[PDB]
Structure formats: C-alpha cells, structure tokens
RNA sequence: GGGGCCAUGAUCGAGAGGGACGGCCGGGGGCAUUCGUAUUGCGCCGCUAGAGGUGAAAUUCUUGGACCGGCGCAAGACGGA
C-alpha cells in the first residue's frame, strides 16, 4: 500500500475485554479480513490471569508488530465487553491492551464502544436466588 | 243515574345513590398488527491456536478450524435504557 508521505492506513481494532479472557483482534476497514489477532491466553500459561492487564498488554505489544509489517499505521478502536445476556463492563485487559497500542509507536483515533445491549434481554444464566457463595 | 263543589289530590333532591350528557385522562381488559436489539442454531469468507470457566482448576469445546471479525438466514422468548 504505497501512500504518499506515508499515511495512515487506518485499521479497526476489535478489543474483547471481557473477564477470563482479552482479544485484541485488529480487521481492515471492512472487518472481514483479518490483520492480526492474539488474546490475553496466548502470552501467559497460567488461566487465573488470562485476563490480567499485563497479559492483554503483551498481545497489544504483538498485534502492534504485525500491523507494522503490512502497512497498517492508525487503528480505530471498537471496545467490546461480555454484553447481552452477561455483564456489559469492561474487562481489566480494556485499558492495558489500548495503552499498550499506543505506547507501541500505532494511531488511534475514532474510539468508540460496541457492546451488545438487548432492547429486552432473554433468562440470564443462574437461578433467581443468583451466583450465591 | 246526571250536576255542583275543594286552594281539587304528586314534600324536598342529600357535600345519599342510580342513570343520562359533555370534553378529557390511564403500563385497565380482549383481538389483530408492526417493530426492536440481543440469545441460540445454520451457511459463506478472513485469520489463527487455544477457547470455556474458576478463589485455583477440571469436566466440556478445539488444526475434520473452536473462540474472535464481517456478511444474512431461521426459530422461539422478551419489550432494556
């Protein structure tokens, strides 16, 4: 891809925060194709912190490498938790993997948060007495 | 049987009730219709090895392609803010 003064090839950045686990997941425009994916459980051995921060970072770090080797220079960022039926938080992983993104030499720009709200949501998992411990 | 006569005979309509009429009001009820994102399943495409879950793990699901991205198909619930 072969731009002028090197623009930005903008990408767009789908980062699964959600618990046990943080995708950081980087498509074209169209989402489609995929530039490169890598998860909090790639980069450490252990599941109690697949979705520690520092393991959403470090796949942020890996994610940034492949998109510089293709021509990728700027990500719009689409922040996705759980959402519909499960909570609609966040992960832990949210802020370490965006950080990471731009502390790695990459763009950001247009944030914005795709989560699946449901206009009415249907029977969420646990009886009506709840997760009780 | 025909007339005369009486101040000729009907208390009030309740800050009781029923009924009517008037312009409104309401997630009131029944029937029909429309829509909304989610959830699960299925088809095609992309990339990739884990993904699910937990205090920690395991059962389970994974190179016959899971989880994740995009496209749109079906079904039944439900009507968030």
């Known amino acids: 891809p072969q731009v002028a003064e090197g623009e930005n090839v ?17 498509t074209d425009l169209s989402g489609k194709e995929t530039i490169c994916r890598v998860t909090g459980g790639m980069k450490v051995k252990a599941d109690r912190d697949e979705s520690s921060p520092y393991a959403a970072m470090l796949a942020a770090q890996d994610v940034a490498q492949k998109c510089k080797e293709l ?21 832990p992983g949210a ?3 965006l950080r ?3 502390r790695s030499g990459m763009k950001i720009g247009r944030i914005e948060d795709v989560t699946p709200i449901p206009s009415d ?6 009886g009506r007495r709840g997760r009780r411990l």
């Open 71 to 91: 021509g990728i220079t700027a990500l719009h960022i689409k922040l996705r938790a759980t959402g519909g039926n499960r909570t609609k938080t966040p992960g």
């Open 121 to 126: 949501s249907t029977r969420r998992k646990g």
């Open 100 to 102: 990471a993104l731009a």
């Open 95 to 97: 802020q370490s993997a």
């Open 10 to 26: 903008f990408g767009v950045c789908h980062i699964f925060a959600s618990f046990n686990d943080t995708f950081v997941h980087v």
